[PDB]
From a paper:
Amongst the Arabidopsis MSL channels, MSL10 is enigmatic in that it has two separable functional modalities, regulated cell death signaling conferred by its N-terminal soluble ‘death’ domain and force-activated ion channel activity imparted by its C-terminal portion. When heterologously expressed in Xenopus oocytes, MSL10 is indeed activated by membrane stretch and displays a preference for anions. In Arabidopsis, MSL10 is primarily expressed in the shoot apex, root tips, and vascular tissues, playing a critical role in adaptation to hypo-osmotic shock and induction of programmed cell death. Analogous to DmMSL10/FLYC1, each subunit of the heptameric AtMSL10 channel is composed of a transmembrane domain (TMD) with six membrane-spanning helices (TM1-TM6) and a characteristic C-terminal cytoplasmic domain (CTD) shared by all MscS homologs.
We expressed the full-length wild-type AtMSL10 channel, consisting of 734 amino acids, in Pichia pastoris and purified the channel to homogeneity for single-particle cryo-EM analysis. The channel core, consisting of TM3-TM6 and the cytoplasmic C-terminal domain, was well resolved in the cryo-EM density map and allowed unambiguous placement of most of the side chains. However, the N-terminal ‘death’ domain (residues 1–165), part of the cytoplasmic domain between TM4 and TM5, including residues 335–386, 397–431, and 469–480, and the C-terminal end (residues 732–734), were not resolved in the reconstruction, and thus were absent in the final refined atomic model. AtMSL10 assembles as a symmetric heptamer in that the cryo-EM reconstructions without applied symmetry (C1 symmetry) and with imposed C7 symmetry are essentially identical. In contrast, reconstructions of AtMSL10 in C1 or C7 symmetry indicated that all CLDs adopt the ‘down’ configuration. To evaluate the conformational state of the wild-type AtMSL10 structure, we calculated the pore radius using program HOLE36. Strikingly, pore radius estimation indicated a wide-open central ion conduction path. In contrast, the wild-type DmMSL10/FLYC1 channel, which is the closest ortholog of AtMSL10, has a minimum radius of 3.5 Å at the equivalent hydrophobic gate. Thus, comparison of the ion-conduction pore dimensions of these channels indicates that the AtMSL10 structure likely represents an open conformation, which is remarkable because the wild-type AtMSL10 structure was determined in the absence of applied membrane tension that is required for channel activation. The open AtMSL10 structure was determined in detergent micelles that were essentially devoid of membrane lipids. Consistently, we did not observe lipid-like densities surrounding the channel.
Author numbering:
A (entry chain A): 248 to 334, 387 to 396, 432 to 468, 481 to 731
B (entry chain B): 495 to 643
C (entry chain B): 693 to 731
The structure:
């Protein structure tokens, strides 16, 4: 549509030029109005060109956001469509997009059949599709997680579109003001001295508003170019973890682990390093405990074996790979012990992370108690008088 | 090591491609404006207005362009690390992940993903384990003063 | 230190070895004695 209107207007301009190109001086007054009309036509042509470049910039930014998120958005949409069947166009579908779901899934599944009913899936989709898509409770939890992910994707799309809309509003404002001032200058309405006074006033306007414009440009470069996180991602800034809430071009809204709302200037964030749990691989855990220096090495080997068996017998929570080390020896009485193991998830699920860590710590405490590993204070020599 | 080398080559090529895209953009805009000026299409006053608007565009975008140029100078000229190298920044060890011209992605020892502005890294000192020689170890223990020599 | 896990495992092994060697030699640490006057 943009190129269509542009070519229409340029054809209008060239047609006007061809008709009046002939040297036919109807009247001196006619020449003045003809010059004014020509200047206005070329001014609106420049305005249309500015509109074209504006829409090109906005569309390339939208395409970058698409290459960033729309792939996962379409994947989630396809997964939701497949789940519903068992129980551009993609952009439009994404924009359009608990207990009840679990009850519906249970009703669909055959009574007294914990596993997913293959017959029901076969009647609704192909066997290969059902296998690719694939305990009723686990299926319900996965469906709830997929619904939450789709809601988060929709919120992220809305945030991106709102940021793009605000950027479009700002760019359109500057474009319109530039177009009107260009039309005024081409009409040649002001004298030289007044034009110089306007020039120095524009220089002062620049000197003043340019600091905030630089801040704004840095913020949008951080938001779009760097693009460190999406809406709903749990991120750490200056050592404190939060959750992304909004995507304003000049600020970002965060929720702390206590649900406290926070506001951060995007320019300030650009200077700081940013960490993202959602985009990170499976995260690592660490537990610290202390034991006496007199502990035999055999007990340490037994503890290592118990840790290994406990970690390998719980693959749904912990990866088999793990390490146990000694940090330092204090006064030849205390040994500092550290365990390292990786979850099957990231720190995005903070509550699940903490529950799993508590379970692992209690398990390690029980294993240490079983092995009779003890800690002791250094004996004190007292001389009476 | 071969996989890491391939990843490093891909990261370098992607950084070069982004740099090429940016340079091509500025080159194309400069070429079209040069063509317009040589065609002599605009009047003097409109040209002066365009000149002051370009001056304002410079005043605004030049801070970010300076940051970008510092970042690319740090990435290419200084070149302190490669992809997959384990480096220490501000006392914390990490692993290089990506080689963006304006940012670098790191993985901490807990596998946590981190983002650092390349301009900020340029100001800080950087340590690299991969490029370092065989490293030294140290162990501390305490004993009584009455211990015989 | 690129192989952080191997580095830490080797350091732990060395620390345990040093602990065993110190225990064999009967090298000990002691707190300073405290003088107490009853009333």
């Amino acid at each position: 549509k943009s190129v269509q209107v542009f070519i229409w207007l340029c054809l209008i301009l060239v047609a006007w030029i061809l008709l009046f190109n002939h040297d036919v001086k109807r009247s001196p007054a006619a020449t003045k109005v003809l010059k004014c009309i020509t200047r206005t036509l070329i001014s609106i042509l420049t305005g249309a060109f500015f509109w074209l470049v504006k829409t090109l910039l906005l569309k390339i930014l939208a395409a970058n956001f698409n290459v960033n998120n729309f792939f996962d958005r379409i994947q989630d949409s396809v997964f939701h469509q497949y789940v519903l069947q068992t129980l551009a166009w993609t952009m439009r579908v994404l924009m359009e997009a608990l207990a009840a779901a679990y009850h519906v899934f249970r009703n669909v599944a055959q009574p007294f059949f914990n596993y997913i009913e293959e017959e029901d899936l076969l009647r609704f989709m192909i066997k290969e599709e059902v296998d690719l898509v694939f305990t009723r409770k686990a299926f319900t939890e996965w469906v709830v997680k997929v619904y939450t992910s789709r809601r988060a994707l929709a919120h992220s799309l809305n945030d991106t579109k709102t940021a793009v809309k605000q950027l479009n509003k700002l760019v359109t404002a500057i474009l319109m003001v530039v177009t009107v001032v260009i039309w005024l200058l081409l009409l040649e309405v002001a004298t030289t001295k007044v034009l110089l006074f306007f020039s120095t006033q524009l220089v002062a306007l620049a000197f003043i508003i340019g600091s905030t414009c630089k801040n704004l440009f840095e913020s949008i470069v951080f938001v779009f170019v760097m693009h460190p996180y999406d809406v709903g991602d749990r991120c750490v800034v200056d050592g404190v973890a939060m959750l992304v809430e909004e995507m304003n071009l000049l600020t970002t809204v965060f929720l702390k682990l206590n649900n406290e709302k926070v506001y951060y200037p995007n320019a300030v964030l650009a200077t700081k390093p940013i960490s993202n749990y959602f985009r990170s691989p499976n995260m690592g855990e660490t537990v610290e405990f202390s034991i006496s220096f007199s502990t035999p090495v055999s007990k340490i080997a037994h503890l290592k074996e118990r840790i290994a068996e406990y970690l390998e017998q719980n693959p749904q929570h912990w990866a088999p790979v793990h390490s146990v080390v000694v940090k330092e020896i204090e006064n030849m009485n205390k040994l500092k012990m550290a365990l390292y193991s990786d979850h099957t998830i990231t720190f995005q699920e903070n509550r699940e992370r903490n529950l799993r860590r508590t379970e692992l710590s209690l398990a390690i405490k029980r294993m240490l108690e079983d092995l009779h590993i003890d800690y002791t204070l250094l004996p004190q020599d007292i001389n009476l008088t």
